[PDB]
Symmetry: none
Subunit: 142 residues, 2 copies
């Protein structure tokens, strides 16, 4: 059966294989899984990361984010910031060790991304981001 | 910080696959977790419970249970996990049946844009194979 022109199928097989390889890579190099890495990278980039905000950004459901954030808490990479004395909700933050992890693992993330796009011309990269965002806009409508 | 997520193709791809996933399948006699696992197994060979649990953000116990259930249903065999021919058929048939959702997804795309999308996705899959 031909699913070459099946966008969902193509994108899912691409994403799944990339994620599986990354699971191995991050685990062997840094002792964390791919999903742990995705969350750490979100925490380094954004402010007031609730579980909701991390889920919105990554597309993983809240249960998945919550379970991973708990693991990262146990590994002492993140801590829950209650903001007890502030007119705002709790937030998840990197600990000092989680920040160090990000510092060292981000170089590896950057190299893998460079590798993924090795054969792309500059305009092809631009075209790629535009088309993914168009897809991302339609999905939000479905 | 060091990485701009908005211009990080790895991140956009993975997010889009997840977002497409949370949006038929009960039609074919399996639930969401079963479908997600089937999908992962279709993407690459000799998967492990550990890897699947990682990338799906699921606990190992849940993954193991679901894997067993898919064994019983004749979709999987076995620790390297692979799809049976019938597991692979399930993925293709259920995808082929869901074609109307694909047309909806690509509604705002001209033919030239669809062509570009598939050209670019193919470059990406080719490269992932080499990584």
């Amino acid at each position: 059966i031909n699913i070459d022109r099946h966008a969902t199928a193509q994108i899912n097989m691409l994403a799944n294989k990339l994620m599986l390889k990354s699971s191995t890579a991050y685990t062997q190099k840094f002792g964390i899984g791919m999903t742990e890495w995705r969350i750490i990278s979100v925490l380094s980039s954004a402010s007031d990361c609730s579980v909701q905000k991390i889920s919105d950004i990554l597309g993983l459901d809240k249960a998945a984010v919550s379970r991973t954030v708990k693991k990262l808490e146990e590994k002492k990479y993140i801590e829950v910031n209650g903001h007890s004395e502030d007119k705002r909700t709790y937030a998840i933050n990197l600990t000092e060790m989680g920040q160090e992890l990000y510092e060292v693992a981000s170089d590896f993330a950057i190299e893998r991304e460079k590798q993924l796009l090795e054969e792309f011309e500059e305009a092809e990269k631009d075209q790629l981001f535009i088309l993914l965002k168009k897809l991302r806009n339609k999905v939000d409508q479905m």
